[PDB]
Design a protein around this ligand. Structure first.
Ligand SMILES: COc1nn(C)cc1Nc1ncc(C)c(-c2c[nH]c3c(NC(=O)c4cccnc4C)cccc23)n1
Length: 288
């Protein structure tokens, strides 16, 4: 019987270091080394922490979603490592990290033209996801991985949900660890997620890209300056209230008004009023 190239044996999967931690999950840099001499390929490995059953089903749904996504700007699925009753998502490793790590260290190499090129590639991966009736729900610069200085990829689908054929949105129940400072008003207010909700999260991701992911100008850092940083449980309702008053993230420094106006179109209060990923692409390619 033939060997499956998507089947990764646990014995040959050697953990190097953690890359990130999330919603009851974690991503590690592992070396798949069947020959045991350290020549095997580096891979990014997503697994669940030992300490919920429903979290396993979510991961299995995430694996199945990524397995069937094929786009230049979507991180490549490599395989799975099964236990079964336990599973690991095996993906390609992108040594440049996400925009959060790469942009502060490479500002000199990355001018506005290259930022608008990344914005285009983020919209292209996002539009492909949207065309397959999926809502990403976690579009942030920490999830935009750097392939090269000319290429970015949407690198994590941990919150990705299918929209039903008859529906315009998906209703979420597991709300706890929501990236609220990236979320559209309908997401914060009603737990409803539209493709237009990802367009809102794209506007925030774009803002981060234009600010080269500087920690001090981050969407959380700026929103907490607007609303206040000592509200605790009341932060989300104070965030809903400022967005209702028309307050939006300011213009990144050195970002021309034309780029800012495309970003502002991602931030129309009503989801139906927001620009689409295809229109953003036209606007970015017109500026290039
Ligand atoms: C050294 O390069 C590197 N630095 N970082 C920081 C990353 C990479 N590279 C890399 N290459 C390929 C891949 C596929 C990734 C990568 C994919 N998802 C990652 C997460 N996600 C979460 O932790 C998360 C998010 C949402 C929901 N649940 C969870 C568990 C973190 C860090 C990394 C990745 N990362």
């Amino acid at each position: 019987t033939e060997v499956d190239p998507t089947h990764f044996e646990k014995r040959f999967l050697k953990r190097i270091r953690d890359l990130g931690e999330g919603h009851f999950g974690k991503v590690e840099l592992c070396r798949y080394d069947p020959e045991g001499d350290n020549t095997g390929e580096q891979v990014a490995v997503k697994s669940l922490k030992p300490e919920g059953g429903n979290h396993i089903a979510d991961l299995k749904k995430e694996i199945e979603i990524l397995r069937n996504l094929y786009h230049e700007n979507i991180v490549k699925y490599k395989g799975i490592c099964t236990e079964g009753n336990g599973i690991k998502l095996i993906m390609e490793f992108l040594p440049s990290g996400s925009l959060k790590e790469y942009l502060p260290k490479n500002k000199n190499k990355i001018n506005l033209k290259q930022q608008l090129k990344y914005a285009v590639q983020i919209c292209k991966g996002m539009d492909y996801l949207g065309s397959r009736q999926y809502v990403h729900r976690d579009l942030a610069a920490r999830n935009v991985l750097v392939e090269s200085e000319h290429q970015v990829k949407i690198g994590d689908f941990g919150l990705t949900k299918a929209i039903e054929t008859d529906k315009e949105y998906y209703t979420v129940k597991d709300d706890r660890d929501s990236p609220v400072f990236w979320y559209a008003p309908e997401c914060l207010m009603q737990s409803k997620f539209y493709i237009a909700s990802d367009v809102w999260s794209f506007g925030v991701t774009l803002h981060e890209l234009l600010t080269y992911c500087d920690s001090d100008s981050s969407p959380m850092a700026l929103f907490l300056k607007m609303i206040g940083p000592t509200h605790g449980q009341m932060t989300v309702t104070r965030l809903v209230n400022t967005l209702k008053e028309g307050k939006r993230l300011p213009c990144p420094p050195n970002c021309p008004d034309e780029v800012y106006q495309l970003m502002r179109k991602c931030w129309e209060f009503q989801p139906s009023n927001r620009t689409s990923f295809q229109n953003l692409i036209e606007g970015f390619e017109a500026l290039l």
